[PDB]
Amino acid sequence: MPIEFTIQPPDHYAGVNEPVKRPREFTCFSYDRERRFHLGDRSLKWFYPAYIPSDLSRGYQNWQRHDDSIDEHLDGLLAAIADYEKQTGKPIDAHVTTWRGMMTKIMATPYDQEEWEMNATFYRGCIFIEENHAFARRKKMMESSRPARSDGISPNLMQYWGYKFETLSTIPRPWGEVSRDEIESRDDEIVNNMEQYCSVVRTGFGNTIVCLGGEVDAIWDAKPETPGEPINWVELKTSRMITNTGIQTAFDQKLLKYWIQSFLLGVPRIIVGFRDQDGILRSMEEYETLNIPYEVRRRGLAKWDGNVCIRFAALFLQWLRLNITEEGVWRIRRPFRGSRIELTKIEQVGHGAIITEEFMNWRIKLDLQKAKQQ
């Protein structure tokens, strides 16, 4: 028989305030413009705002793209954790490890109708999760095979109107150290999205403790003097101007995923840029990650509440910890408008490519150190 988890209506999970253990950054890593991995914060940027009227379509022909046909699995996240374990002389206490994107798709599942598919594996009492890259690529081939809209807006142009706004809105050092010309000239810098800062956080829902990796765009000031204190991160986003309440509905539905995505890494502030339908930037606004659900609740135009997502994630993670107990690879799938998540064991032994041999060799060395210490 196949194994299945039933997605109840939100009403079934609601009204219970399941506890969340506040996110702590405990290791971090950078990608540079040429996609070399480096430990630490060398690719982090400071926020500093754009010139209000500017053309987001400017420079589209020169955009340096990360090639999503390349599959990176978990590689940077496992490496950054393995360094923290080497520095501390102990395994981390988290027993589930993943990219934030899977955590978002899980937490959105009670409300979102979209299909998603994942590969997962178990090793030495710990669980690891990734998106199925083949499913993602096939879906993106099908989406790029659709006929164009009457406005002519390419999804690729929408995605460039993403990353251009991040280059217009950042600086490579705190405001005290950059020159004037390095702020004024930014309209003419060529955009790159291979360069990233990834933050790794320890977090937990109810009884289960989880380690999340994810991208963070920028910081508002300096990192704090000692670990584990709240950090003034910023997330930067773009969307069309809210010209009428029909757009406000779609925006207040986007805010569910924005809130989850910034909540899971403790990012306190979102800054949103609004384009017109040709691509000119027209305004910017500030939102606080604690208050987004409260504002959407107060407008009442969209019907979601994060306590459902949190408890659904806790129950689902616990259900994975009950059903998955041995090595090999499992596939998790959510059919389009499907009322049940599907689970199946697809490979009997090993990890496919979800885990590096370097990570296996490090954990083997660490368990040999536990035996030698005892």
């Binding site: 405001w175 005290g176 000031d221």
Partner: protein, 630 residues
């Protein structure tokens, strides 16, 4: 003149201070005003800065009192006035007391030109007001008295319990306003500085509002019987309406327009240079230059100033636009003056006027044209020095402008061809200031070993100390409006004459001539910084004697602090003067450290910080359309 101009052009920038006054009891005792409550002005201020020579001079020769009979009576009046300000401002996070140190040479020449007149008036016609100068016995008594009063306040006034008190007394170089501005730049450069920090400054000079604009902190306030606020935010709304021009070939940017307007104000008049013949602020010379700037901004290809540096190629357009009008401005002036004075020697309103001017004032042959251009280039170098001194700290301590008079705009030729470079120089010692800026009448203020040099006919520098000198009233009505034709100091000759001797000074006098340090004082109540200073400098686990502040633990004061030698924490606080007119305290709750600013190795920048939230419009749609129409 500057205030009468500002009040009449920009009246909405003013509002009266909300003052809460002490209760006086039936026995004549005073109940102190509890400053732990919210400020009654309806807005809360993080930082207060005192330009302390806005108090010390008034106390020594007041308009509305008899003068104090002795130095202790003067210090008590200084405390009464200083306490009254803090009670109405109630600063939550920093109080800074700045006292004038040794000044740059370009300022010393203006002080010399003031003090020789005061001495010749007293000679033609008790406490000598020249005693208020770095390195006198009086400034030593003040420098001790202020540290006592701050320590005593940190023991006995609950509103100061979380306050940092920063003192920069007369032993530390720079004038008070030019100390305070460097502290504000130091904080803006820090990565954790709150962009909505609220500041107040107290002082008498009209330059403080020009400095207010030049900070680019948006919520900044200026303060000056009742008191009034000037708000920098409201003046920025006036300038944003007035300076705008459509269809420029570059991105419009308000901070650059404000800096250009600030430069055009210092061009009309400042303390360092004589003002141009074509300009007086009473004639609205700022409007004339503003009109010229708005008319050339479409074709200069950009703004006149960039972060306190001036573009001399663009400056030529402004000076050409003035030069086309000088003969009309002189005719307009003389017509109005001769008309007014009929109804109530150089002949600026007749032809050939510039040849007679250069003959009578500079004593040159009028036919030497290139001398006029040389004076022009020297004046343009002066304008470049003045702007950097306000925006980027002191650019040279030894530069000065070597003439009693100013050139015409018609003399400013090819400014685009100039090279401007400055050398930092040596800051003068306190006695080197005292001998530069005192006439021989006040010599009781300085060590005896130098007295001969001021009065002996055989002195190698007697020519710097004339017993009488010419004043040219220059068609003005008062000796304070005219120019004193005093000789300029050849600085190497004076320094040689004081490098000789010096071994004759007392060990106290020799010690008094050394440079000082700033100090930070705090109360034992402070919720983090007192734990840090006691644990780091005074626990048995003694750390390094220099320490870095943390902005989350210091309430956003950013910088470094240093342990003081020979000081012992928490002994008895003793009042220093003879008659015990103020209390001692048996166990001092305060502690003291040396204080160091985060150094501006970079340029500062004329920009709003990220996270600035400007106040809502004080000007109405009607006020904006009125000023655009005017």
């Amino acid at each position: 003149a500057a205030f009468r101009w500002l009040s009449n052009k920009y009246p909405k920038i003013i509002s009266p201070v909300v003052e809460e006054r002490p209760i006086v009891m039936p026995d004549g005792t005073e109940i102190p005003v509890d400053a732990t409550r919210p400020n009654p002005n309806g807005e809360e201020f993080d930082n207060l800065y005192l330009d302390m020579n806005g108090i010390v001079h008034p106390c020594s020769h007041p308009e509305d009192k008899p003068a104090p009979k002795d130095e202790e009576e003067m210090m008590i009046e200084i405390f009464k006035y200083t306490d009254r300000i803090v009670k109405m401002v109630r600063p939550r996070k920093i109080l800074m007391i700045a006292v004038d140190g040794v000044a740059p040479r370009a300022k010393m020449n203006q002080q010399r030109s003031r003090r020789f007149r005061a001495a010749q008036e007293a000679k033609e016609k008790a406490f000598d007001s020249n005693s208020i100068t770095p390195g006198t016995p009086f400034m030593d008594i003040l420098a001790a008295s202020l540290r006592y009063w701050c320590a005593y306040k940190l023991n006995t006034d609950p509103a100061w319990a979380k306050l940092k008190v920063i003192i920069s007394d007369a032993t530390v170089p720079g004038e008070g306003e030019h100390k305070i501005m460097e502290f504000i730049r130091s904080q803006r450069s820090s990565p954790e500085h709150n962009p909505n920090t609220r500041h107040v400054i107290y002082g008498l000079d009209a330059d403080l509002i020009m400095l207010g604009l030049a900070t680019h902190e948006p919520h900044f306030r200026v303060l000056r019987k009742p008191f009034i606020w000037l708000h920098v935010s409201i003046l920025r709304e006036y300038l944003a309406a007035e300076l705008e021009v459509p269809n420029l070939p570059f991105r419009w940017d308000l901070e650059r327009a404000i800096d250009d307007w600030v430069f055009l104000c210092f061009f009309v008049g400042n303390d360092f240079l004589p003002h141009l013949p074509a300009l007086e602020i009473r004639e609205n010379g700022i409007d004339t230059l503003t009109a010229i700037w708005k008319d050339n901004l479409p074709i200069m290809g950009g703004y006149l100033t960039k972060d306190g540096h001036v573009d001399l190629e663009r400056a030529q357009y402004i000076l050409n636009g003035l030069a086309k009008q000088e003969d009309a401005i002189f005719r307009r002036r003389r017509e109005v003056e001769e008309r007014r004075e009929a109804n109530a020697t150089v002949r600026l309103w007749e032809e050939g006027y510039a040849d007679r001017y250069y003959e009578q004032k500079f004593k040159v042959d009028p036919k030497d044209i290139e001398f006029r251009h040389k004076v022009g280039r020297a004046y343009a170098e002066g304008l470049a020095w003045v702007l950097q001194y306000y925006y980027q700290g002191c650019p040279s301590w030894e530069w000065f402008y070597p003439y009693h008079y100013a050139p015409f705009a018609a003399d400013f030729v090819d400014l685009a061809k100039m090279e401007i470079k400055f050398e930092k120089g040596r800051i003068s010692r306190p006695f080197e200031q005292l001998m530069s800026v005192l006439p021989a009448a006040s010599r009781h203020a300085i060590p005896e070993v130098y007295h001969d040099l001021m009065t002996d006919p055989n002195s190698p520098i007697i020519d710097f100390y004339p017993e009488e000198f010419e004043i040219d009233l220059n068609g003005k009505k008062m000796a304070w409006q005219g120019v004193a034709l005093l000789p300029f100091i050849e600085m190497p000759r004076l320094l040689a004459a004081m490098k000789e001797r010096e071994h004759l000074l007392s060990e106290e006098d020799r010690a008094r001539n050394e440079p000082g340090f700033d100090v930070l004082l705090i109360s034992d109540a402070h919720p983090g910084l007192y734990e840090d200073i006691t644990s780091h400098f005074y626990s048995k686990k003694q750390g390094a004697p220099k320490f870095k502040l943390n902005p989350r633990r210091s309430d956003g004061l950013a910088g470094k602090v240093e342990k003081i030698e020979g000081y012992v924490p928490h002994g008895s606080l003793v009042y220093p003067l003879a008659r015990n007119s103020m209390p001692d305290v048996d166990y001092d709750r305060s502690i003291t450290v040396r204080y160091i600013m985060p150094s501006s190795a970079h340029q500062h920048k004329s920009m709003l910080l990220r996270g600035v939230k400007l106040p809502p419009p004080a000007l109405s749609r009607s006020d904006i359309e009125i000023i655009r129409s005017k």
